[PDB]
Design a protein around this ligand. Structure first.
Ligand code: HEM
Ligand code: HEM
Lengths: 145, 145
């Protein structure tokens, strides 16, 4: 359950999430678009779900993709800000889960984002330790799907 | 016609928005729920769009409502952060507009949030000057509806 998954976010996992977010979250537009383009590059099969965005290879020049990417980063910001209170983290996670459930995005599908996160992370000199911390956060959302 | 609506956000309006948000956005959970419960109390008919949230009477104690309220505040945080770049503000405003259009929420219906915003601002002692500034930000989204 999402309640069990939220409990896996221990003291050090939270710390690693905050430390890395401090850097990644500094450039939401830049890292946001980088995140999405990497997803479409590594997992070409996911592009179908983003039909509304249009020509996704345009990257930053695509207003819809840019608007979506920035918005995704504020969702991550939301998660980071709720780390102190698991009750609040859970209700926020379940809120964002609703629309993904509506789009038939499964847990396995959602998990595709870990690759892109690991990459953007590595580009900022944050290794496996941080990639794994984020994978645990993503797992909380997966549990709600 | 979003860009034209954004043109109304002059240097002083943006200054008033940032200053009041410094206070309002410091307690997203508390002020977010206050906004929603005030909307429900002032315009009972708006509850019709929120059947998914359940018993909205519980207010803060209702996990679904709390989750939605906090998330709404990050949309505003997003807007405030994009004020200086019309191109980014516009693509972000249109991104958020998609789901509201899908729910058949008209510009007039969306405009009902102005009353609640005014009361919440007043709670923190921000007068009409600030309420009008926020009305202009809301008008930008209304232009996309
Ligand atoms: C860290 C991971 C992710 C976060 C935090 C996240 C967050 C969001 C948010 C906030 C939205 C905009 C609000 C909405 O319309 O629901 C959204 C939309 C969307 N997300 Fe996710 N998402 C993530 C990963 C994914 C993945 C991996 C997929 C696809 C396999 C996915 C598919 C979608 C789709 C299809 C949309 C709608 C796009 C549109 O038509 O504008 N998301 N996501
Ligand atoms: C300050 C203005 C507002 C902002 C910034 C805002 C923001 C948001 C956000 C971020 C979401 C969650 C993402 C999504 O599903 O699209 C949302 C959902 C929603 N909004 Fe708005 N909204 C505002 C005003 C309103 C008003 C006045 C109404 C209706 C009279 C409305 C009705 C809805 C509904 C029905 C949902 C879905 C809630 C659910 O079932 O969980 N919104 N809004």
């Amino acid at each position: 359950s999402v309640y069990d998954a939220a409990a896996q976010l221990t003291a050090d996992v939270k710390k690693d999430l905050r430390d890395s977010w401090k850097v990644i979250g500094s450039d939401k537009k830049g890292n946001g678009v980088a995140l999405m383009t990497t997803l479409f590059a590594d997992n070409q099969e996911t592009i179908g779900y983003f039909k509304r965005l249009g020509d996704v290879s345009q990257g930053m020049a695509n207003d819809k993709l840019r608007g979506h990417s920035i918005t995704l980063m504020y969702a991550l910001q939301n998660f980071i800000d709720q780390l102190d209170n698991p009750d609040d983290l859970v209700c926020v996670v379940e809120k964002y889960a609703v629309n993904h459930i509506t789009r038939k995005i499964s847990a396995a599908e959602f998990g595709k984002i870990n690759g892109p996160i690991k990459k953007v992370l590595a580009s900022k000199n944050f290794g496996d330790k941080y990639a794994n911390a984020w994978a645990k956060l993503v797992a909380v959302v997966q549990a709600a799907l």
